[PDB]
Symmetry: D2
Subunit: 390 residues, 4 copies
């Protein structure tokens, strides 16, 4: 039983403490869940289950995926649950939502991701009591999403490990980030992000403001200031504040159904899910995650690396993104033709489905047959999925 | 060709701030992952992916399921991820792990759950800054796991809604709790929990915990009726007729039936069907009602075909309502007690009662089983197990 | 046996989270102590003891008055201690420092106050441990300085008690506040605050910023905003954000010595301490605090109410200041001739010595013989001190 | 003008997280204020001012000394204020309260101290906001009372400096602590603490518990276990957990009035205040504080070191207490005859008046003519007072 993606949508990737500074993740997800159903003509009462990945749900209440579904009109008879595979959470939900229909336990699935790093609180265990001495108020964003629990250093330090073994110079990493910014400004001005972005109305006390543009994109990004930034994680390192992904808020999802179910409704699906794969690697080089994951996904689909017509590779770091391209050897001209996470933004829970939206809508805009989306997961993991157009 | 559970294990359900007061959830899961692999002869290097549900991972670091796997010997080549469907997380992970092998994306899966409510921290958003006035330190246990986000009241209040429409008196609810307590002490003294419980070494000297500490030995009824109501001053649910706050973990080994025959393993049970259905968030306790009816429908079984049933006892009112609704024989429901006496680790109760379900079916020679739980927010999960 | 004030100084009263947002209280006191000694030619090695009042020292370390003395050059041979009588702390230290020389236990005393509400932290008791339930992180500024411990409501509510029985309308209180606002900036534009204010150097990473003007003073203070403000503490109250004192940071002190000691050093003192008094009242009507305190101070000095040439009355609230003026019957034209704490600012621990600086430097500028400074203290108390010219 | 102490009282010195774990400081002070007034026959309506020292008032509300007076029956007509001179606060209030009557501004003064380290909260500045990164919740007890703000280390580290320069071996400090322990248990069993200790009723929902015994005193303290304790502040140091004072809660005060007023009331006073002194030293060697302070106190009174019949010297640390004994040369058999703070306990805000209660009641118990109480103050200071019997 095949399984096609009938429609997809996503919110604009906001900056850290920016447009979505006080917007909970489920409010951004409910807007997406309401958007994918309109773009396919499917009603909310037909959704069997909503599957939204999220890495930082602290303070959001019971089951944030349930709140995003109930507010979006999904009836109480349906179910909802969350997931945490770090940066591959948004894309794995599409794979998990695909398995719900593959086994015959569901027919219509809204799968994607959501994240709100601006709403990430500070936590500390105080049940036993602090009899004497100062204690730490732990930032859940840095701890539960940006700090490797096995070695203790930041996700930028494991990128320094990728910056050493592959021998990627500072100037080469700066040229990859600035190129990603220019590819983002060109696609945004040409309206290539309008199809994927659904407007979100940020209700405020001083008036509602509709946000529909990726705020992280720097207009007129130069290179003389890219080399003037100090390294953030190592005094003698290469990763800085510009060549790495930032902290962002946003959401993204898609509508999942069988191919025979879409043909009955007369729906033209965005793409066909042919295969998927997830492989783990050394936690010191988590950025190499997409390397075995993409090779396993293509092997399951029966495709050669040269068979791909379009590729979306999440740009968590400049060193990590260059290393994956230099190993797989795929044509960089078809990789992130509209930019990547360095310019658009990196919502951990939503980046998996965010770049999948960019992957789907760009394939039909250009008429591409075969695609491949993949991301690197912290702790030494990687996820990948292949999409073929209808 | 199906999908069987080769082995299963769980830690002793500790009390809130008790034996596992300072033990992280992934430390309890690694012991379970090491136990399910030991009881089936499967090595850690053969696990493709571990799927462990957890509701309160705040402060535990990146992917607690990944930490529990690396310490248990699972190699870095395997993958790991967490999931949150509240109370049905432990049982849904088995269903999710079942789907990994059904589509052919994996061969060996360690699926279960874990929870550590004692390690649940207090949180507060402080990025924007508090210029003036005091602010609230939010308990992640109460907020993210025990408070309905749609109506605002506690999960004990949703039991009052079930206590009214079915008209279940406090004395009947008190008789259900005391009966569950007495049925728990019988199994603990008789060593019927020893097979499922794997000892955990809590590192002034190491203390090995291997017995469910929440079980009250000699629970009476004169004190059950003297307790004040906990969630409503004119309510019926108290501290004895409702589930408590507990820490623990539980998991199982998932593999194909044709894969078990190659290893010469005698599996605990075969996963025949599963289902998850949502209900009115005002009556979340009714969750197992449509979930159990759909699970039997997919497998093709009548309610009377079941030989053993494990129904999580989140509250006395919700557990009594499901029994009066499904009409199954109560003598085969929670034969060794329930969550009122053993304990209710939210993320692990789904796989906890599955361990009690699996080990009791083979101990007695039962053919067909059914485990189910009630999920907050108006949801319910259920799974059916057939013996080999 | 007399005791004269040889010199005095104070820093510019900064706004809440304004210029002194990150300046500790002892840094503001050290600048004053270095200023109190330099303007009189007295060296630091001659100071017997420094007495600085402070209400919110949480998080500043052991004895902030000791830190303010060591940084100002006072040698280790001297002693230091803090004091807390709420709002009358700055003026009480001068009375306490006067008693050190009166009994013969000291010769040179640097007495004053300091406050830094911007650095006031949030606190919560967590030694016993919070096993279950949410708990509150209490602001030390509101709790230990702005909340009456006997009845629980804010200091704005106890001003409402003066606003009800005394029957002071909002429009009359707004006319009293606007008059105080206009009188404060006039002294700033005419440079009437330059002599008493010592410049403070706010050390910054992007360059040092010298602060020498009271920023809390509203430039061009009109009445169009005074009548449009909603009540702050009670939906049916009269005190708002304009007619009440604000939250401020600052410090102030003075040099205390015997009259025969100033003549030996050839110092012309600012004023002679003639008497002082502190009397308690009903905590519900703390604004009446200065009423019995001033009557006892004049009685100890032997002066009638009509003998006063200049009066400084701290403006904690518009309602409390109006009630004191009509009961004592003194001429309002000599009361707060250069404005008050509503416009200049109200550092609780320092306002006692702040208005004393305005009292001291203005008496000879105008040729006043006798003065009287007073403040209202929360919890039903009042402080007063009388000053005679040399 | 003389000034006698008509009566005095104190609560039992509780252990850290012990009997007074959740008892606020003002509740402990109110019991003392009500006891000192009853033991002298003076009514509450005659109290002119209450002077209570406290070092950690964070979280207790506006003026904890005012709360302890209002609950103890002191009428609103009286005033109250706090002070912070660290460990010498309790004894300095008696000296400051003495100066109130010496200058003629008061007649009856209730002076003393109080402390409740168990109720000391954790604080953190959060007005500016924590955009990213973890932050510290600072323990006010360790920071504002147990950490020198000039060098950063604990008060045990400056005791290590006293343990080095004077060349005090570990065995000598251990022999001093065990001797103080034995002298404390003997006085408690012989009922020598019953007169000074007033019972405190800890009201609780599960029943009231009357506390009337110093809980910190270890019954049967040997030296074989004193040498088995690890050093607390330096891995190669001498100060441990047994030879140093602990963390404690409690209160203490006294009644101050003129000598001619006590004869009219038929009151037999405990002693006559002849002199007092406070001198500062190097904060690195605060333990030498009592050395010049006690020599200056005797110098003002006109007494030789050999004229003293009884001496109370606060035992904050074994090294500092031995150093004072080795310099002054007084007979150690008359110094802390009933033990010290090493065994009884060290409430910072109350230890100044705590040892004064032990000093006063012991002079009449044995018939001693002249006494002397002194303490070492953090930050390089020391306080001392001389007591003559009537
Ligand atoms: C790197 C990180 C710490 C950035 O926070 P930061 O250190 O404060 O740096 P900022 O992004 O806030 O910007 C800081 C400065 O860099 C400059 N800058 C940033 N990006 C730039 C760019 N792309 N081009 C030019 N200048 C840039 C800004 O103008 C700013 O200048 P300023 O200091 O005068 O204000 C944060 O984004 C991070 O942790 N990333 C980790 C990525 C990650 O973990 N991914 C996980 C996937 S596995
Ligand atoms: C609130 C809650 C945590 C109980 O905490 P609690 O109110 O402090 O009650 P406790 O369990 O700590 O025990 C309190 C008292 O009950 C008494 N008690 C407890 N269990 C008893 C029993 N089984 N029989 C008789 N008496 C009992 C104890 O002696 C104790 O007396 P004490 O207060 O004098 O010490 C519990 O009601 C709860 O919320 N459980 C979670 C339910 C839930 O949300 N489940 C979700 C699944 S959908
Ligand atoms: C009155 C008080 C409560 C105000 O706190 P606040 O309102 O939360 O702080 P704000 O700055 O936001 O209020 C100021 C607002 O009014 C406006 N405003 C206030 N006074 C004004 C004036 N005099 N003229 C013109 N505009 C004015 C400001 O522009 C600002 O704009 P906003 O309405 O959009 O917020 C504060 O001054 C206070 O704490 N008073 C009590 C002090 C005290 O108790 N002292 C001890 C007593 S002895
Ligand atoms: C040592 C200190 C830093 C903290 O240590 P601590 O956490 O209190 O030590 P603990 O209470 O946890 O227990 C210490 C051990 O020593 C033992 N011990 C302590 N004092 C003892 C004594 N006087 N005699 C015999 N045994 C003793 C205790 O029984 C305990 O045994 P344990 O190991 O089984 O716990 C603290 O006590 C201290 O010295 N604070 C300084 C106070 C201060 O400086 N005030 C200002 C004065 S200038």
């Amino acid at each position: 039983p095949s399984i096609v993606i009938a429609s997809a949508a996503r919110t604009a990737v906001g900056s850290f403490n920016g447009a979505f500074a006080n917007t909970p993740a489920h409010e951004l997800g409910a807007t997406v869940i309401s958007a994918v159903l309109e773009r396919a003509g499917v009603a909310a009462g037909e959704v069997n289950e909503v599957i939204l990945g999220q890495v930082l749900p602290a303070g959001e209440g019971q089951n944030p995926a349930r709140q995003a579904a109930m507010k979006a009109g999904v009836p109480q008879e349906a179910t909802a649950w969350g997931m945490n595979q770090l940066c591959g959470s948004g894309l794995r939900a599409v794979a998990l939502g695909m398995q719900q229909i593959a086994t015959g336990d569901a027919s219509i699935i809204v799968a994607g991701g959501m994240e709100s790093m601006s709403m990430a609180p500070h936590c500390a265990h105080l049940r036993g009591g602090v009899k004497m001495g100062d204690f730490k108020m732990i930032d859940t964003m840095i701890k539960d999403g940006l700090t490797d629990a096995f070695y203790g250093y930041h996700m930028g330090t494991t990128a320094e490990n990728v910056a050493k073994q592959w021998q990627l110079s500072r100037d080469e990493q700066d040229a990859f980030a600035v190129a990603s910014q220019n590819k983002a400004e060109a696609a945004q001005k040409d309206g290539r992000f309008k199809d994927e972005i659904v407007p979100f109305i940020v209700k405020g006390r001083k008036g509602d403001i509709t946000v529909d543009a990726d705020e992280e994109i720097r207009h007129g990004a130069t290179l003389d200031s890219m080399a003037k930034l100090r390294p953030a994680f190592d005094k003698e390192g290469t990763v800085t504040a510009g060549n790495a992904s930032g902290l962002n808020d946003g959401a993204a999802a898609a509508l999942l159904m069988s191919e025979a179910e879409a043909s009955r409704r007369g729906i033209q699906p965005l793409g066909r899910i042919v295969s998927w794969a997830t492989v783990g690697v050394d936690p010191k080089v988590m950025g190499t995650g997409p390397i075995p994951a993409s090779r396993k996904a293509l092997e399951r689909a029966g495709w050669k690396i040269g068979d791909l017509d379009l590729v979306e590779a999440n740009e968590a770091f400049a060193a990590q993104a260059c290393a994956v391209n230099k190993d797989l050897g795929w044509d960089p001209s078809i990789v992130n033709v509209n930019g990547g996470a360095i310019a658009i933004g990196h919502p951990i829970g939503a980046s998996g489905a965010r770049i999948l939206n960019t992957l789907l809508f760009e394939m039909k805009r250009r008429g591409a047959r075969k695609g491949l989306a993949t991301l690197c997961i912290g702790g030494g993991m990687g996820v990948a999925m292949c999409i073929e157009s209808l």
